[PDB]
Amino acid sequence: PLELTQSRVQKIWVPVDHRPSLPRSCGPNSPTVIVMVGLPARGKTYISKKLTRYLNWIGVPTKVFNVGEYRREAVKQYSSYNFFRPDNEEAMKVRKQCALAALRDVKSYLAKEGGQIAVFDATNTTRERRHMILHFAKENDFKAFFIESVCDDPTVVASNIMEVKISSPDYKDCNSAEAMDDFMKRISCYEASYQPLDPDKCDRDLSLIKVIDVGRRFLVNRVQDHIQSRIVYYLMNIHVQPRTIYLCRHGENEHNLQGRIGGDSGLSSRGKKFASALSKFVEEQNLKDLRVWTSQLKSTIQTAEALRLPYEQWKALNEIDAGVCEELTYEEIRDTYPEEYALREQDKYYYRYPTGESYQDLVQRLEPVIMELERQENVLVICHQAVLRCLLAYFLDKSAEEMPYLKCPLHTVLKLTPVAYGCRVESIYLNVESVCTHRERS
Amino acid sequence: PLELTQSRVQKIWVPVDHRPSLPRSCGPNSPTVIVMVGLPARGKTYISKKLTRYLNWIGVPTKVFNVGEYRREAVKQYSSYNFFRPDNEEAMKVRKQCALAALRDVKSYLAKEGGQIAVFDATNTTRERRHMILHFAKENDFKAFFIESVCDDPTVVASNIMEVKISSPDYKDCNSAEAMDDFMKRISCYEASYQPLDPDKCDRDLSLIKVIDVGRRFLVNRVQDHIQSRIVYYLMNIHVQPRTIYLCRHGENEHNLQGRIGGDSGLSSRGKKFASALSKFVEEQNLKDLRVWTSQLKSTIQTAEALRLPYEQWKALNEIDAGVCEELTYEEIRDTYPEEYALREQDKYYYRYPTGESYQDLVQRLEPVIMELERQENVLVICHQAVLRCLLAYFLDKSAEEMPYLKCPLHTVLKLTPVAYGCRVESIYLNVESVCTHRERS
Ligand SMILES: O=c1[nH]cnc2c1c(-c1ccc(Cl)cc1)cn2-c1ccccc1
Ligand SMILES: O=c1[nH]cnc2c1c(-c1ccc(Cl)cc1)cn2-c1ccccc1
Ligand SMILES: O=P(O)(O)OC[C@H]1O[C@](O)(CO)[C@@H](O)[C@@H]1O
Ligand SMILES: O=P(O)(O)OC[C@H]1O[C@](O)(CO)[C@@H](O)[C@@H]1O
DSSP, X not given: XXXXXXXXXXXXXXXXXXXXXXXXXXXXXXXXXXXXXXXTXXXXXXXXXXXXXXXXXXXXXXXXXXXXXXXXXXXXXXXXXXXXXXXXXXXXXXXXXXXXXXXXXXXHHHHHSOOOEEEEESOOOSHHHHHHXXXXXHHTTOEEEEXXXXXXXXXXXXXXXXXXXXXXXXXXXXOHHHHHHHHHHHHHHHHTTOOOOOTTTTTTTSEEEEEETTTTEEEEEXXXXXXXXXXXXXXXXXXXXXXXXXEEEOXXXXXXXXXXXXXXXXXXXXXXXXXXXXXXXXXXTOOSXXXXXXXXXXXXXXXXXXXXXXXXXXXXXXXXXXXXXXXXXHHHHHHHOHXXXXXXXXXXXXXXXXXXXXXXXXXXXXXXXXXXXXXXXXXXXEEOHHHHHHHHHHHTTOOTTTGGGOOOOTTEEEEXXXXXXXXXXXXXXXXXXXXXXXXXXX | OOOEEEOTTTXXXXXXXXXXXXXXXXXOOOOEEEEEESSTTSSHHHHHHHHHHHHHHTTOOEEEEEHHHHHHHHSSSOOOGGGGOTTOHHHHHHHHHHHHHHHHHHHHHHHHSOOOEEEEESOOOSHHHHHHHHHHHHHTTOEEEEEEEEOOOHHHHHHHIIIIITTSGXXXXXXXXXXXXXXXXXXXXXXXXXXXXOTTXXXXXXXXXXXXXXXXXXXXXXXXXXXXXXXXXXXXXXOOOOXXXXXXXXXXXXXXXXXXOSSOOOBOHHHHHHHHHHHHHHHXXXXXXOEEEEOSSHHHHHHHHTTTSOEEEOGGGSOOOOGGGTTOBHHHHHHHOHHHHHHHHHOTTTOOOTTSOOHHHHHHHHHHHHHHHHHOSSEEEEEOHHHHHHHHHHHTTOOTTTGGGOOOOTTEEEEEEEETTEEEEEEEEOSOOOOOOOOOOO
């Protein structure tokens, strides 16, 4: 009775599966359609992309279905705002067909591809369009959650057009002035039929969030579940204010020199040289304010000590726990635990060290770090190889499969600048020698 | 250069403090005054108490300053709603003095007692009163965050009067009908001067949350920092729907029999008997729906396996990590690590095991568990001794000092029923023998 076995890769206790002669599968909670609402240049695509990046990173399979991309596919080349005219009978039919084709792909993603969240990125400015999306959701047993972005500031609208609209494939043959002018006319095509969400009377029973004036204010109505609550929390923590995220590892430590994993060793002579080089680098950046974050492990704290700046220690930033393999070299791991060594090499993201962690566990631990990084402005995170790969995979939208192999060398600062729909990444090697701890897949 | 030392109790790396002949202290971010807003019987005290319980448990020193308690102290016995009349010149002076005395204690708590959050629990229904609180906050360099509870449902108002108002010390000599009638008249005294928060025009620059219709809808304006964002997230996850929380440990394991700590041992013969007894108990509770949560450790999973109910494994529910002391008996800990043994006995909450955890680390790990427990209805959590003490300290509002000593015996279900401003706790021993793992302070 109650016989369990521990799965070799993830180390999960499962009931001993003495399946009968005819083993049965029973494969595989309700998926969600996130409905973007609002006029063009309201940051709907920005919200869609960023939210999808966060949801995928935390392990919720998410995909964006942008109706404009279906339109660029159906219609050869973009001519002008005339395509978006309410009196353009033909283009209105094409645009409806594109929205229906995107919804068809939403159904296939959620019901047949193991997707959990589909972000329907369109204007969805009319009650008619939204009623149709609701009908589609109800008939397919999908939940519907509306995210409306409301902003009437012309400075914000002009900034969005300049930052990411003029550079759109639609405006390839256009100069900045013509593209901006055409886009303003394009916005005007949607203004007459636009019916904002009304949670007070009409949309009282809908699950929604109204993001007002670039996240200055929020109207939240009927949050049904865990995932909607998480989305709301995320939207309330992110901002579009300019800032820089600097990510680096502690300076080279004594375990690095011996080729040993984990432990709590101190900086080597080179590691101390990096720490001084980092102080000079930080000083040269001339940042008004800078928050410095470290792990609770000695090597990151010693590195921060060289900066002569206040810093905060996070236990969540501590290197991946290697369990029984802590303080061992990779050669000693292969010779003492050959089965464990091979299992990790085959499934590096999901592999859990015995009495230790996986990269998957790291993500769960680092979620509060990410949420706080979003809230903050200029931040320097002094951490460890596996922790750094996880954070970098979040900022650079890298998959779980690529994450354990991202290059994060010692004595090198990764300068992240948020621009358009992601991060510009600059690498700055601080000219101090160290050992190489990067190991490619085999 | 960069010399650090590890603190004996918490195991935190600190700069080697070679203080000069004259060591200097420099003792000790801006505190927050949470302003409750709304008519009586709107759950302001419920919000105040619950939020304070959560904030203290996560490690943010928080205290409630209820103006009504200052009034019960200044005015001998309560007579009737006549005391609350707007034309009652004398009582209006007394009530103002009570609010000012509470604010005086708010200043002393935040500026001189190391308090981080002061919850000002009063009606604060007029712009005049709120302007005065803002002036008080600005002059003392305190942040102000407003929490308004808006509800016009008479069923909700009557329920609040019946649940917690009629049982108030004010209505000691009154029967349920007279107390209810007096309280309705008391509410009416505040209705004429009530000016709700207006984030649209008047209160546009104030940091606030409007909780509408018992958390059905929210208006969030200008969330300035981390703590306000956390409060908003918490308020959006809690509910007042009836439910039961059952908490228990895994059935007795092999390590329990050997007096060994940590590890991942399986159920003993008695532990398996408890698991069967738990299934019978669960069945007898006749719960429409029940969510079952376990840790990722074998003993809790084997216990859940006996229920024949779907369950979810949480790594956050895994027992406290004893680091180097894992799988050792307490006798072996005292003999191999006597310094460590004595340090723990002296400071059980903050003590961190070498390469392991503290009860303080457990709280940080269990925060997502608590947030999900709040969202849910009927939940059974099968966990471990230290994890259980932490969760119980949250529900029962126990301090960090009492937390490591809470009695959580094996083969015993703790049935938690939310009622009034906290939890009713029922203990159910499932009549299966086990060893005793409880150790009192020495
Ligand atoms: O509300 C907007 N209106 C116009 N533009 C916008 C936004 C937001 C935004 C919306 C909601 C939230 Cl919680 C945060 C940011 C981002 N952006 C944006 C700006 C420049 C480039 C790309 C996107
Ligand atoms: O909004 C209310 N109006 C009247 N009463 C109320 C509430 C809330 C409440 C308010 C906000 C939130 Cl996020 C959750 C619950 C709780 N209570 C309550 C009910 C019975 C006894 C004690 C308290
Ligand atoms: O996932 P990988 O490639 O083993 O890298 C993580 C390892 O790297 C180290 O930071 C040492 O370089 C160890 O602490 C950790 O076990
Ligand atoms: O804090 P205390 O009293 O040592 O209790 C926690 C210990 O109890 C155990 O659950 C064993 O009873 C251990 O796993 C853990 O180390």
